[PDB]
Design a protein around this ligand. Structure first.
Ligand SMILES: Nc1ncnc2c1ncn2[C@@H]1O[C@H](COP(=O)(O)OP(=O)(O)OP(=O)(O)O)C[C@H]1O
Ligand SMILES: [Mg+2]
Length: 318
């Protein structure tokens, strides 16, 4: 059904997606950051990943960048040189190193410009390649993702530091639903494709079928509204968070926490490429309770027999 909800979903979609204005400003910011990188290292290369790159950006979007360079170069050395140029060129931020990983976090621009810079973070590039490819495979993914991220933020269930889930996690929960749950599938599993060639980067297989022009279109013709209602329905009522693991490495999407050795693991989502990383590791016990509760409320709302049926409340701050 869901005809007026679809129309509603597209209306909200258009108000929340990054404007061309902002996209173009972010892209100018990246060009500026590249010239600073040139000035101190000619061979190093500054790449974008996540939201802006994959086209899943809300308004007021943060920026995820990665410096690529020769692995035989010490990454802290050029990281500090790059940091020193950024201060000098007028950006404000922090230089930190977590374990062996040097990071630059920019916060302003002498209001707020917010942008992270990783060094040789080759795996994030691939994570974004996968999601970029899926975005190009079916036009319904992008608005679906943006609405789910919008909903998660309004429900205070999108805070990794406070026991809930990252946006990337929610994206994977969407993809997982569209690949291994909905029937017919909205997408195939590009990682398990017969056509997939292996590609090892930093010890993980990041290969997937990227011959995108060869794939038959989805045989699922559900409106954006049905998909969304399906998605909320599945995580509210059907998915089992204590036993099961969100995965992209099984043909049938079945994976138990025990096989994986994942008895923190209150919510378990196996990264598609870094399969040793639980994307939902930040999820606390109280976090998960609020996440499920919101999933259920979303379902209850979209079932509602009332008139007027208040779809707006889907995005009211909980
Ligand atoms: N929890 C995580 N574990 C491993 N990698 C992550 C995690 N969160 C983010 N990343 C990496 O950074 C990329 C996107 O990060 P993130 O900002 O959470 O999502 P997003 O697409 O930017 O949504 P936003 O609009 O930024 O909230 C994807 C992945 O390579
Ligand atoms: Mg981001």
């Amino acid at each position: 059904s869901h005809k007026e909800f679809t129309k509603f979903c597209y209306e909200v979609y258009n108000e929340i997606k990054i404007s061309d204005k902002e996209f173009k400003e972010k892209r100018a910011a990246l060009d500026t950051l590249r010239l600073c990188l040139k000035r101190i290292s000619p061979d190093a290369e500054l790449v974008a990943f996540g939201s802006l790159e994959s086209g899943l950006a809300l308004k007021n979007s943060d920026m995820d960048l990665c410096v690529l360079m020769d692995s035989r170069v010490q990454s802290d050395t050029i990281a500090l040189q790059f940091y020193e140029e950024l201060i000098a060129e007028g950006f404000e931020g922090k230089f930190l190193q977590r374990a062996r990983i040097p990071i630059i976090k920019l916060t302003s621009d002498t209001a707020s410009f917010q942008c992270d810079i990783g060094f040789n973070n080759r795996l994030a590039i691939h994570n974004t390649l996968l999601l970029s490819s899926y975005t190009k495979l079916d036009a319904r993914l992008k608005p679906m993702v943006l609405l789910v991220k919008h909903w998660a933020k309004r429900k205070q269930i999108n805070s990794p530091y406070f026991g809930t889930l990252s946006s990337y996690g929610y994206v994977l929960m969407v993809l997982y639903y569209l690949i291994h749950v909905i029937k017919p599938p909205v997408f195939p599993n590009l990682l398990l494709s017969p056509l997939k060639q292996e590609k090892i980067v930093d010890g993980f297989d990041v290969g997937f079928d990227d011959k995108l022009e060869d794939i038959p279109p989805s045989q699922n013709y559900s409106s954006l509204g049905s998909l969304l209602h399906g998605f909320f329905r599945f995580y509210a009522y059907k998915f089992e968070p204590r036993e099961k693991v969100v995965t992209f490495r099984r043909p049938d999407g079945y994976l138990t926490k025990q096989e994986k050795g994942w008895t923190r693991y209150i919510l378990a989502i196996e990264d598609p490429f870094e399969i040793s990383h639980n994307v939902g590791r930040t999820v606390s016990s109280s976090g998960l309770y609020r996440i499920r509760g919101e999933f259920m409320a979303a379902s209850r709302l979209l079932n509602s027999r009332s008139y007027p049926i208040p779809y707006d409340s889907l995005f009211e701050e909980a």
